[PDB]
Design a protein around this ligand. Structure first.
Ligand SMILES: Nc1ncnc2c1ncn2[C@@H]1O[C@H](COP(=O)(O)OP(=O)(O)OP(=O)(O)O)[C@@H](O)[C@H]1O
Length: 378
């Protein structure tokens, strides 16, 4: 069986396989090329992926996500302490190790973050197996450049418990560079900038590649800035509109809010291609249908400060790496959020018109690169 490349993201995961000199990004059961890093526990079953996210508003306390934020950390970890204040599921301390506590089939059960991720990993494996028509064992899993040894360890373990023989754990920016072939020897040193803006995190990495060896010269970004923050701005915008039209504040109703958020996220994707999208939600609050729409222009102004602030970490990365704008040779977009036109304009304007590498779907670039690497490693 071929070795596969797996991008284990904070919000979405993606799997690809190298076959006949071409990389195949494998779609799932619902035909999506990336699947939510969601796991859900109910009275009768364990849901994973799309099925899990498709019922989150109906089972918030038993639907787990953001496991990538817990993986490899200690319960006492300041990050953990700050984050758990926002999760609808329980996080308990087990001799210093954080554990997620959920109710499965009427019984109370807890899981280590690596066990949850192994679940998402299992779903990717079977997605690949369903496509390949053969058993998948060897794999290359990616991890952010800033992950320490514990985090890499935990990610490796999540893979082994998923029945995957992890050939190697490589950095996400490095995988991205490999996808574009920027690892090829050209008898010269090349500076590559990876701009990764996913569903929940923002990373900027400057890699220096010479003789085929990568050297992460600098990194920056924000661990709490991603596509979900954009959705939230839309949500707050529509809560206000609903109130204008029906003098009904739907903020208290968690279900209404979550249904609207899903509508927004979807409208947002449409906005990357069209100039306006419509929000059609039957019986949002009480029995009031919420039919409306947004234009790309309004979407941009709702998120203006957020989009603009994206350049702050870019400047920082440059100064730390001791390089000027003119010194970076290539720029590659990674993450679903980079499909946003305004973000592409902003970055390009910042680099005085330089062309951005974006021919490969940004949310597939990391998996794409890992698949190539997996192939060579086997
Ligand atoms: N066409 C699009 N336009 C805008 N955003 C999009 C588009 N397609 C997907 N996205 C967004 O990209 C995000 C998911 O990104 P991606 O698949 O790169 O995540 P990820 O690797 O899990 O990232 P992170 O680990 O930072 O969350 C979601 O916020 C989704 O709404």
């Amino acid at each position: 069986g071929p070795a596969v490349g797996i991008d284990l993201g904070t919000t979405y995961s993606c799997v690809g396989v190298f076959q006949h000199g071409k990389v195949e990004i494998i779609a799932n059961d619902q035909g999506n090329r990336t699947t939510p890093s969601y796991v859900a526990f109910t009275d009768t079953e364990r849901l994973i992926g799309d099925a899990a996210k498709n019922q989150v508003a109906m089972n918030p306390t038993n639907t787990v996500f953001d496991a990538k934020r817990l993986i490899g950390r200690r319960f006492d970890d300041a990050v953990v302490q700050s984050d758990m204040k926002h999760w609808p599921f329980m996080v308990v301390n087990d001799a210093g190790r954080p554990k997620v506590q959920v109710e499965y089939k009427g019984e109370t059960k807890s899981f280590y973050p690596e066990e949850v991720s192994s679940m998402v990993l299992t779903k990717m494996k079977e997605i690949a197996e369903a496509y390949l028509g053969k058993t998948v064992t060897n794999a290359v899993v990616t991890v952010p450049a800033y992950f320490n040894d514990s985090q890499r360890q935990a990610t490796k373990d999540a893979g082994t418990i998923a029945g995957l023989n992890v050939l190697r754990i490589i950095n996400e920016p490095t995988a991205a560079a490999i996808a574009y072939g920027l690892d090829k020897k050209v008898g010269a040193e090349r500076n590559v900038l990876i701009f990764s803006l996913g569903g929940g995190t923002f990373d900027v990495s400057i890699l220096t590649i010479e003789d085929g060896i990568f050297e992460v010269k600098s990194t920056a970004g924000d661990t709490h800035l991603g596509g979900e923050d954009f959705d939230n701005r839309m949500v707050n915008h529509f809560i206000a509109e609903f109130k204008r039209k029906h003098k009904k504040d739907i903020s208290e109703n968690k279900r209404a809010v979550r249904r609207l958020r899903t509508a927004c996220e979807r409208a947002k994707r449409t906005l990357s291609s069209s100039t306006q999208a419509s929000i059609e939600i039957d019986s949002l609050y009480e029995g009031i249908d919420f039919y409306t729409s947004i234009t790309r222009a309004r979407f941009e102004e709702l998120n203006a400060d957020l989009f603009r602030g994206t350049l702050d970490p870019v400047e920082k990365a440059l100064r730390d790496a001791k390089l000027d704008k003119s010194q970076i040779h290539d720029i590659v977009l990674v993450g679903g959020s980079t499909r946003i036109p305004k973000i592409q304009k902003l970055l390009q304007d910042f680099f005085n018109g330089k062309e951005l590498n974006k021919s490969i779907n940004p949310d597939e670039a990391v998996a794409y690169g890992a698949a190539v690497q997996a192939a060579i490693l086997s």
